[PDB]
């Protein structure tokens, strides 16, 4: 009754506030992927051009631009922010502090810390949805949300950014009363997409039984 409406309200507010999550994480990814690649090349092989690696660390470090883009994503889920997200932003910042100009000895640590943080951003969106959907009274929706959360997390472990795009799109469609697109949009290349979308269809059915 009254509590179900307030639960739906809480969900819709979160979804609207976080609707740029995938666009913004993709934007960080696109600015940083060349830099990440250069560091991995240097760390995994015989490539030795330290000036490239210094320019790559510069992308992650300069003017705190990338750190602040991550802090902006943290602020969006402030009401639900997980402790693991704040911890991983700080670890990224510490590894950046250790990098002095023309010293590349910490380069792989910067790249690794960035990659863990990028995945945890996606996990923090899932965790926020988990917190909100857990407060619902309807047991069918609560159960279907938990399965959606667990299939989403398995998707993230396969590919963080694709999973985030699918999660943001699916929940956005659901709370805007658009029919969920249940077919794989990425060639079934990502093996976890199919089970995610199946759980999304079942969550959609449960959501509509409430909304009615």
């Amino acid at each position: 009754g009254h509590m179900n409406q307030r639960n739906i309200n809480e969900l819709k507010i979160f979804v609207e506030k976080a609707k740029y999550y995938s666009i913004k994480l993709d934007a960080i990814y696109n600015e940083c992927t060349g830099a990440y690649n250069d560091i991995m090349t240097y760390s995994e092989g015989t490539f030795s051009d330290q000036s490239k690696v210094n320019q790559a660390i510069s992308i992650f470090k300069k003017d705190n631009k990338i750190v602040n883009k991550f802090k902006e994503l943290e602020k969006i889920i402030e009401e639900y922010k997980p402790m693991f997200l704040s911890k991983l932003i700080d670890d990224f910042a510490i590894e950046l502090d250790q990098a002095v100009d023309n010293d590349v000895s910490n380069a792989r640590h910067v790249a690794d810390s960035y990659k863990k943080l990028r995945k945890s951003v996606v996990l923090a969106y899932i965790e926020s949805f988990d917190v909100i959907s857990s407060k619902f009274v309807d047991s069918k929706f609560v159960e279907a949300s938990k399965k959606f959360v667990n299939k989403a997390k398995e998707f993230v472990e396969e590919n963080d950014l694709i999973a985030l795009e699918c999660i943001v799109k699916t929940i956005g469609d659901m709370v805007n009363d658009r029919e969920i697109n249940s077919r794989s949009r990425y060639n079934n290349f990502y093996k976890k997409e199919a089970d995610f979308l199946g759980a999304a269809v079942e969550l959609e059915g449960a959501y509509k039984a409430i909304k009615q």
Binding site: N30, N37, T41, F47, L161
Partner: protein, 59 residues
Amino acid sequence: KCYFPYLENGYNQNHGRKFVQGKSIDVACHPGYALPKAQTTVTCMENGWSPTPRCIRVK
């Protein structure tokens, strides 16, 4: 020589190989990613690979 880079979200069969000036290489990214402007080949030139191989997110 140009070193072919590690490619986040790409097919990495050429990672760590080095190639002489003028060599062309096919680059393939995983679904949901692509080289900018739909390009699929890069060439080792005087300042490195042209264009730069990297697998950006694509809509």
